[PDB]
Amino acid sequence: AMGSPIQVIENDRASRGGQVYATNTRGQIPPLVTTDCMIQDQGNASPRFIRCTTYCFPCTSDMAKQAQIPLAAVIKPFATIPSNESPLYLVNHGESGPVRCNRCKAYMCPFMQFIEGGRRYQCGFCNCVNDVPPFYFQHLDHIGRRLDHYEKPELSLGSYEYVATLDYCRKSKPPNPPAFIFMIDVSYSNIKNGLVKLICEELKTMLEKIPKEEQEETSAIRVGFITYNKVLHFFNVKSNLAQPQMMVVTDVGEVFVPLLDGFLVNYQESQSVIHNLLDQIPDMFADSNENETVFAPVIQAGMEALKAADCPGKLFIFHSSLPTAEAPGKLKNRDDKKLVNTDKEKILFQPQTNVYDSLAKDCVAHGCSVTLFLFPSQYVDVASLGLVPQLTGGTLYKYNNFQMHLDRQQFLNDLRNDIEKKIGFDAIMRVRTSTGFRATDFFGGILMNNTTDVEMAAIDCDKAVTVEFKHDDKLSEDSGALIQCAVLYTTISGQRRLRIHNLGLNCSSQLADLYKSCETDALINFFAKSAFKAVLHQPLKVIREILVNQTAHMLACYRKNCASPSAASQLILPDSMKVLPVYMNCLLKNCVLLSRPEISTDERAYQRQLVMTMGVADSQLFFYPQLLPIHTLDVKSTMLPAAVRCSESRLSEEGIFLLANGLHMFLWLGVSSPPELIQGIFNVPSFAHINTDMTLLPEVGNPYSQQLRMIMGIIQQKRPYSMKLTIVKQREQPEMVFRQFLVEDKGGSSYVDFLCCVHKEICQLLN
């Protein structure tokens, strides 16, 4: 009988919740992402910015190879910090720029040991001695505190930002503020489903909420508008035209932007002209009878437009179907049954043409990020349409078989949300480490040309990059392992800025210490991304095998080296890894690593992408849904009910539950479901009275319909995508889908089965 996910999540909330986590100790283990506590910097970076698979690295390569515990870090450089937590400080080092070690180039941080009266500081990453520049010199005092420490954030805090001098800028000149280019697919499909009008009409409202720093009064971000269908329609919206102009480019294949000045303007200055155009677009194409569309050319154009205005930018593309019109990036309907031991299954998850990868490079090359709002209704080849936006650091929003009376709010919520996102532009993340180990692999919505620079055309508060480390030499159980994440980027006001995240981990020659410091959620996030990237390179059966065997290996190692002697009829799991098996099985059951029977390739490619960007909070929830009992709800005096295991066993014919994974939210209803509730919620008297196909927001209700809406709100709170509500009536209804999210059941193997399997191979490693 194993300690369940829920039990583990609850126990930690009890012992560590509502308590200040001060990041002042070195290899300190933080609370679970599921636990809500207050964080105070104090030296090391907040667990909100970076978490690790272990907070104590093995001292040597062989030790690491014994345990086989992947050493990695999940980093969300711009994680949203709670209002009740101290904000980052902007540090300015003047003309010279931020002080750094001449050798390893690490930034001035709490890890530099000032010596010899404070004239020379020895770098904490490579041990090189440096000369404290004139303007920065300060006296040490008792053991070095240097009478500065607590006064300068870069010396006492784990996270903070530096002002970047011109030599941190492209072409050694101050960058320009970014621009948002909205590009609308106006082919038939989107004209009929009323999407075109929806976007144009709603766009008049949202263009106001465009981000702008407090230090400024109006946003420095300008905007541009385009429509298309195998042909591009650019629009001139200069702040001196009572009427907007339209320039049509038909030379797809050798696309170009027919403008400069009139394309990319201050929305405020050209307000009436833009609105004018926005009122028009819908009518303009109303009778369009075009069905084929292009795609690469659109990205190609927006990028080109930005390259010309010589500024970074973000493309908001609204597309509907598979781009079949002849032109580069033309996509065929290549969905094939090569997927079980095909060994050629990887091809399904890769773009068709070789153009998309290039376009992505060109975009990153010019700091152009592309975010895609997709409204397919049939195959669309997501592996292709999502590449550029994934590599460009953008976001992919897919609304299958879009229907206005149902999905309007889901989309408009995502859109608003996305436009208001805190975002950096034309960025490059570099992760420096202390002597002994180094960053050797990266996973995220990123692009890399060399092996040290993670390039993100755009980055937001939701994106997380997962970094794997490997042993370079040997670490000292005395100095431990250090980490410094640095992200150079341009702000929405056009300022070159550096964000720093320092973290000090412990190191040890003892395996006990390695395990005692692990974090299942962190490990699960790595394994998932690692596996998902591998899908595009190896047979899934090979990937799954590696996962299972690494899992059995980690546990077998602990068994034969740390665990006190116990019977062979028992399987021993370290506290740090209590729920690791459960989650591992969830990853293995996931559609991305599974197969054909149902679930479209488009659904697999999509999910595979969504995870690649996830932080630890997100992956934890994604792989282990949250199941809440609603019928047993405490009326008005609530605070979100206790979660219940992800198994059918915890469902009751008399109950009503809420299941959410971060993308989907299911409202399950049992047959003998109390009519009292069905009334106070769906306003109808009985169970058989509800129609699933009407999954829209139900108001009314005084005690319950309100208490349920309250929790649906609190659940969505920290979640980036606005979840798609899906009502499920018990017995033989859509439920089949629902059953998939009861990850503890068989549905691959059940939790128990997988446990049973692991033990077999752990025993096979005879010990």
Binding site: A563, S566, Q570, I572
Partner: peptide, 7 residues
């Protein structure tokens, strides 16, 4: 440490 009887 959590132990489980596989039997």
């Amino acid at each position: 440490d959590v132990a489980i009887d596989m039997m």
